[PDB]
């Protein structure tokens, strides 16, 4: 009887330590995003285009963090909160996740036009931030519908209840196709836009004769690496999971165990984007730093 069930292996050590890490991220993002919102909205003078992008990014990250406490408690003893929240909470989380990433793509395009095309009149197309931010928010809601349509609590025997998807008898294959959206409009498309824009932006800054060119490049490099670090590990694991299910890579009980831990670990790493965003994009500028001090008084 060489064939036997591949019993899942779970360790209590991982689960409760994750809760504190989720809670710590919740506190910082809630405080950090509010300060960014507080600084911009307090004074309405000099509301440049970048101020609008940051304002939406702060809102996108603030809402995303707002759902963390429920998600953290889920990892403890499974989804005990019912089916209705498994849809609403999943909608709010994914809508902001898509919006947050796409804004980082829009911000990069704005910087590309501001620097590379500073002289020409094409840079005048960056005054449509008001509508462009509306488009991104609208597009994100369109890409989160599958989560709302095909999610429910899936009671099982080996595992505690989970807020999984139910697309029919062939849900296993259909779920894999739905993963193309996060891995196409969420990682690859944003990454290519960011690298292209920052790829050429660094070419002009590397040739200009300013004094602040040195700090600008180091900020640009930090932005790119932080994006890759937070999201690349998660997508590579997700791609590995898809390959294993399709039998492209040999499947064994040990491999399924390894990927399960990898997905849990990376997801924690990816969630940190809601915390570093205020520091990387907003609080690294003179205007915001000087602004915060004046508001205190």
């Amino acid at each position: 009887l060489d064939a036997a069930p591949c019993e899942p292996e779970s360790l209590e050590i991982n689960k409760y330590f994750v809760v504190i890490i989720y809670a710590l991220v919740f506190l910082l993002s809630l405080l950090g995003n509010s300060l960014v919102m507080l600084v911009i909205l307090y004074s309405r003078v000099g509301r440049s285009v970048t101020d609008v992008y940051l304002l939406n990014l702060a809102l996108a990250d603030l809402l995303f963090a707002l759902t963390l406490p429920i998600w953290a408690a889920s990892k403890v003893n499974g989804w005990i909160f019912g089916t209705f929240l498994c849809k609403v909470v999943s909608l709010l989380k994914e809508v902001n996740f898509y919006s947050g990433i796409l804004l980082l793509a829009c911000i990069s395009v704005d910087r590309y036009l501001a620097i590379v095309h500073a002289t020409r009149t094409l840079t005048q197309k960056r005054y449509l931030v008001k509508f462009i931010c509306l488009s991104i928010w609208g597009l994100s809601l369109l890409l989160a519908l599958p989560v709302l349509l095909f999610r429910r609590t899936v009671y099982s025997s080996n595992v505690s209840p989970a807020c999984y998807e139910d697309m029919g008898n062939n849900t296993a294959n259909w779920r894999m196709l739905l993963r193309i959206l996060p891995q196409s409009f969420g990682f690859i498309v944003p990454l290519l836009i960011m690298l292209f824009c920052y790829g050429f932006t660094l070419r002009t800054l590397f040739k200009a004769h300013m004094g602040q060119k040195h700090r600008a490049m180091r900020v640009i490099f930090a932005v790119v690496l932080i994006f890759l670090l937070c999201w690349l590990p998660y997508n590579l694991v997700l791609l590995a999971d898809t390959l294993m299910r399709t039998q492209v890579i040999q499947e064994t009980c040990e491999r399924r165990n390894h990927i399960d831990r990898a997905l849990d670990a990376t997801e924690i790493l990816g969630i940190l984007h809601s915390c570093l965003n205020p520091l990387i994009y907003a609080f690294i500028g003179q205007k915001f730093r000087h602004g915060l001090l004046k508001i205190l008084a």
């Binding site: 069930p5 591949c6 019993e7 899936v154 999984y164 139910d166 296993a172 499947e251 399960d260």
Partner: protein
């Protein structure tokens, strides 16, 4: 119990049959959100769990025998 962010089939390999006398219970799971194929898992009298092939003619007969 365990907490899984991914649901996977509980069976990898499959046997063509087992001696009925050593079978204590059998679990039949229809296709669902966590698995594309039907899974028949047999819990032996010794505490070991073994897979059974749903398409096997013998497997269908065995379940009928127990339900007697």
């Amino acid at each position: 119990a365990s907490v899984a962010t991914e649901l996977r089939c509980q069976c990898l390999q499959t046997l063509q049959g087992i001696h009925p006398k050593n079978i204590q219970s059998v679990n039949v799971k229809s296709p669902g959100p966590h698995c594309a194929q039907t899974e028949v898992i047999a819990t032996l009298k010794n505490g070991r769990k073994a897979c059974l092939n749903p398409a096997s003619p013998i497997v269908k007969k065995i379940i009928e025998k127990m339900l007697n």
